[PDB]
Design a protein around this ligand. Structure first.
Ligand SMILES: NC(=O)c1ncn([C@@H]2O[C@H](COP(=O)(O)O)[C@@H](O)[C@H]2O)c1NCNCC(O)[C@H](O)[C@H](O)COP(=O)(O)O
Length: 244
């Protein structure tokens, strides 16, 4: 089965934006979130990775707009950002999205996260936001502002709890067009039976072909942000590339 592509729509104040390594001063803007989402759908997206960046950064919410976007889309939505308790989880799922991602909550409230995993199964994936410094793989929460512990210990815990799916980002590569971290992706995929979704750094069609070589090891999909918005390549080119 080919690598699934998930065009990203990261939302700040109703707008589709990109950042370089999550920094405030690096923001590029690409029109309304709804137009971005419908545009990728028109180009053939099977999935949209829809993120509330304001919620992720704890500075506000785009929930009502995101609910409208999910409602308007025919294709499947992976919704993320600020899902950290029973209210926010239920509100996300009530949009009718295909699944959600929790990130910070896996680091800060492992007990809640385990119970959510146990009751929601395939509708909840966990985002692992990784920073590697001197070979030390650390997780980051709260818009990458906090340390969330050792990647490998947390990965094993979530795997033992029956976590359905992992979304793995190298925060150093995110929004850089510097290429994906194939070693990190393989490392995670080899240490869980759960499918892995690659996120961050894709810069070319060759980058997608490289990720596609990991599909047999557990890398089921790839989230693509900047490369699409910055027009490095088109979605149909990308869809064709993961098959060639
Ligand atoms: N500093 C940040 O950018 C950031 N801070 C938090 N998030 C996201 O918030 C969501 C969970 O929020 P919670 O911590 O659970 O409240 C997770 O999906 C987490 O990745 C962040 N990123 C969310 N956006 C993910 C992408 O970066 C995008 O989906 C593409 O993969 C871009 O990569 P590319 O432009 O290099 O292609």
């Amino acid at each position: 089965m080919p690598l699934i592509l998930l065009p990203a729509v990261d939302v700040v104040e109703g707008r589709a934006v990109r950042l370089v390594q999550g920094k405030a001063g690096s923001q590029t803007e690409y029109g309304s979130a709804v137009d971005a989402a419908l545009g990728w759908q028109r180009d053939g997206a099977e999935w949209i990775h829809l993120v509330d960046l304001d919620a992720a950064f704890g500075r506000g919410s785009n929930h009502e707009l995101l609910a409208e976007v999910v409602g308007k889309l025919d294709v499947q939505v992976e919704l993320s950002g600020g899902i950290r308790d029973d209210e926010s989880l239920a509100a996300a799922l009530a949009t009718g999205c295909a699944r959600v991602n929790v990130g910070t909550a896996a680091l800060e409230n492992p007990q809640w996260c385990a119970r959510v995993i146990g009751e929601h199964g395939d509708q909840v994936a966990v985002g692992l936001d990784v920073q590697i410094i001197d070979g030390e793989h650390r997780l980051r929460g709260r818009g990458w502002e906090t340390d969330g512990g050792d990647l490998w210990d947390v990965l094993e815990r979530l795997d033992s709890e029956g976590c359905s799916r992992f979304v793995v980002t190298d925060i150093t590569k995110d929004g850089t067009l510097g290429g994906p971290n194939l070693d990190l992706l393989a490392g995670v995929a080899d240490r869980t039976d759960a499918p892995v979704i690659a996120s961050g750094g894709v810069s070319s069609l060759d980058d997608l072909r490289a990720i596609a070589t990991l599909t047999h090891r557990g890398v089921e999909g790839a989230i693509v942000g900047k490369a699409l918005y910055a027009r490095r390549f088109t979605l149909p080119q990308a869809l064709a590339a993961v098959r060639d």
